[PDB]
Nucleic acid binder design. Sequence first.
RNA 1: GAAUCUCUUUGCCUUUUGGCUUAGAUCAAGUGUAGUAUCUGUUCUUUGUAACAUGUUACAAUACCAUUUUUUGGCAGGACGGGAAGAGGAGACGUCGCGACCCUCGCAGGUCGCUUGAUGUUUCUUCUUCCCGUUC
RNA 2: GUAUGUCUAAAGUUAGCUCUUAUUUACUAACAAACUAG
Lengths: 87, 73, 295, 82, 70, 75, 77, 92
Amino acid sequence: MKLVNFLKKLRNEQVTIELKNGTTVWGTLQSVSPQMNAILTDVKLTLPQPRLIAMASLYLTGGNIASLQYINIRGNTIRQIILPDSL
Amino acid sequence: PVNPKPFLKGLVNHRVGVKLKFNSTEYRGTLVSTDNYFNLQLNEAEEFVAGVSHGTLGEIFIRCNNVLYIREL
Amino acid sequence: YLPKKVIRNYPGHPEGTTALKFLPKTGHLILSGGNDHTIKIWDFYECLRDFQGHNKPIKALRFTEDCQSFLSSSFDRSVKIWDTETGKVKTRLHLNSTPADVESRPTNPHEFIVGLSNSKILHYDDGLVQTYDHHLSSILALKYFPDGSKFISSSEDKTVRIWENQINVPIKQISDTAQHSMPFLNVHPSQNYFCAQSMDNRIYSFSLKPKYKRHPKKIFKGHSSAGYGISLAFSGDGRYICSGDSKSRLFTWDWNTSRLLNNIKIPKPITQVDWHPQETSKVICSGAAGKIYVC
Amino acid sequence: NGIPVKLLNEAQGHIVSLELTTGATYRGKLVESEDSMNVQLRDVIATEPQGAVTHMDQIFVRGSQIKFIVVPDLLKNAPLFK
Amino acid sequence: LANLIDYKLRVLTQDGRVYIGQLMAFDKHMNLVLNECIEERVPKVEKRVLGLTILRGEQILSTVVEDKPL
Amino acid sequence: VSTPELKKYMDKKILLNINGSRKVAGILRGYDIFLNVVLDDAMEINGEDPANNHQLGLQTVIRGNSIISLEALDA
Amino acid sequence: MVPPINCIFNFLQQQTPVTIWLFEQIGIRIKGKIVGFDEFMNVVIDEAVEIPVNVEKGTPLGKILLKGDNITLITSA
Amino acid sequence: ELEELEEFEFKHGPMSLINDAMVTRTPVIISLRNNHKIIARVKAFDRHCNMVLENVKELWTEKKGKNVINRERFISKLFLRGDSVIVVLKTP
RNA sequence: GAAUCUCUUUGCCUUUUGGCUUAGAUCAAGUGUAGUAUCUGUUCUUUGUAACAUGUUACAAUACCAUUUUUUGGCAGGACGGGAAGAGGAGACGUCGCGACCCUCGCAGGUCGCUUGAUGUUUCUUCUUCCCGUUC
RNA sequence: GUAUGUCUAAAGUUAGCUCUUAUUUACUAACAAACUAG
Ligand SMILES: [Mg+2]
């Protein structure tokens, strides 16, 4: 049905979220919103290869790989979230 | 006064062309189906890159979010 | 939407709370004129102030569209214009008769109409301006038109007279052989209908046309409104009609079929009924108890 | 309703600053704020992203081109502490 | 996020600018209001103090929590 | 949707700036809930220094997703 | 004193040749004749001619349904 | 019966190739807005063309100071926002 | 077998014609304004769970891609750093600072230098020597 | 226009349908171009 409710099955799942600015988030979802807004924990984000804007955002955080205790991401910014292979 | 959903469902089974919003890519093919929200489904799609052909692709879908226009050839 | 539950308390006077109205288009305040005590304002919950300077009960408490000052119609032959912000003395109309409902023209804060019970109506400014003497009986309730510019009067006679902006002569005087009277009346908010209580327990509805004749089947019959000064009400943009009765009951109404919808058993004759101009489903009512039950 | 929109509706009669999504900043007196974050702004002093500074009488920016408004700091005491 | 009320939020907007401020309230559209917000562009360097500002949820990319309250 | 109050700007020479850094002056004839703005006396202000009088009385209309802002030239 | 959906249709009755601008693409414009539209300003246009803004040429494209989300500014000639 | 008018316009509308690729379990190639061509199988389809894929073989392009090289990775499980979706193309 | 309820018919009249004379007598010959009443013409519509003292708080279920928000207008010995000197980075627009000959004078930052202060747009086109830190 | 009829605090009695809108028709007027009532 609504695949927003598919992401609500993914609580405490160790995923890798990729964002629209190229930000690669790696961590575990605590919960997700009905507008796909994803809160996460124990997550360090990389800005893969390039090192060539966004990058500024990564340095904005105590973060290139920076890890933050709690991260809330707007659901409109997600390109694709990779789920654990055992699922 | 051909309104768009009367325009385009009547334009089914015609070799139509669609320019994307990026203008790097166009698609020429027969429009098979179109919903109310203007998603497009083309068969025998030939990709036109910057106005020159890229190659034959086949049964194709185009998201609503990228259709700049659609033309009849 | 329909009121269905008796929600909030609002314990006002232990006396009657004989007048309830709203600020138009800003549902923040109410008014409550009890029998012995003076006017109280409830918010939404809270309370603001008393308005000392009355001795007798109050018929009606009408605002302006400037909304800063309301108009008090007490039984003590005295009309007082009170600010809702400070509560000072603009005028003190010591009158000859016990005044009826005291209203204001929507254009000017100057233009200001006081009904009496010695069959007269007096127009005022910020100070007599023009009399009005065509009713034979004590005048009961008043209205206006969209944005004013004319005026509506009805009495203990069955007559309703549309008077104009400072003109004695009625355009239409509305009378048949079977009408009891028109003791209270409110403008339907599309500003084209004309609803009025009548003591055949029925709420008649006329037009606002030059050919001013009534329309059939829009008559609201199932009441006990015979011996009490009961108010009318209208929802936002005219979806229903609420009206109290003497069964300690509040009765709502449709428009196209005009049939009974909710016969509530609110704990004394329910008289004063107002809607919200903001909340599209809730209705404030008070009878002779003083506890202001909101539906 | 929306609490930020309710916050912005109380900001009428106050001097704000509006930075736009292309980058330009609009400092002016907020008189009329719409429910869709549209704002009528009087006596606006405007600054380009490159630094070109002008003053204008009336500006009216749509919702979806606003980065952020800055309301004056008197608002944060009441009625939005609850 | 209602859990996250009244914390300092290091919130990352669309253009790489980072806002740090105390979360006064949020809504359905993630419109944020920030007490004593500061704005920094290039990443301590290049920061501007704004104060009580709004922040529309159209521009936020992510928000993280900075510190505890008082 | 609330009506965007531009009644103060009716029959007024306003200055719409547009996505792609376009700037178009004109006199307002109408608007809607999507802020789609109708302009009498269309004046395209191009880049260097012409001023393209575009539609002098033929009442152009601009879609609300492309309107950045507007300055009333008069009060 | 004309709301804009009543100001699209007067291009349609009088059948005027119409110049339409795209959205965040300033190099190209489209000119043609308005033949149909909807409530979301998705416009079907007749005799559609591209206008390279940077002498202004044209490639005749004829019938085009231009999707309204790229429509910016509606004029005529 | 709200859902049947939703799902039968879904059936022979433009969502057919996302409905046919999954049923026949045939890989469709997906080109996104940042040129991440994704050839993958479909597990599920959504209203927004949200897609859950399996054995994803994302291929993209990295440009440097000489001949462009091809970078590709295999992703076993993938969830994809429909916003990046431009083209769903089924290969026979 | 004793009796209740509902019908049909009959009987009672049940809101059931309460004076008289010359049928008591005689019947528009306009208009305008207005009022009342009616017809016709015309247009629109069809819940569980937890905590605290019946109430309050928290979390889930039920109710929801078209321009202003969340379903994208997107993409394309050796190294390093700083300061100084010599030989073949510079000009605009603003935005905040170190000095002051200035202004101003009290309890509820404006102006001028910078004598090499910081910083974002926007156009054009490095080597040698010494000193101080980090690394092997 | 009469007859005639009706109203009038100064004084305080003890706890098909819903609708806008115009034409027509009917009955009325001591309302108009110095006076006429049972
Ligand atoms: Mg007689």
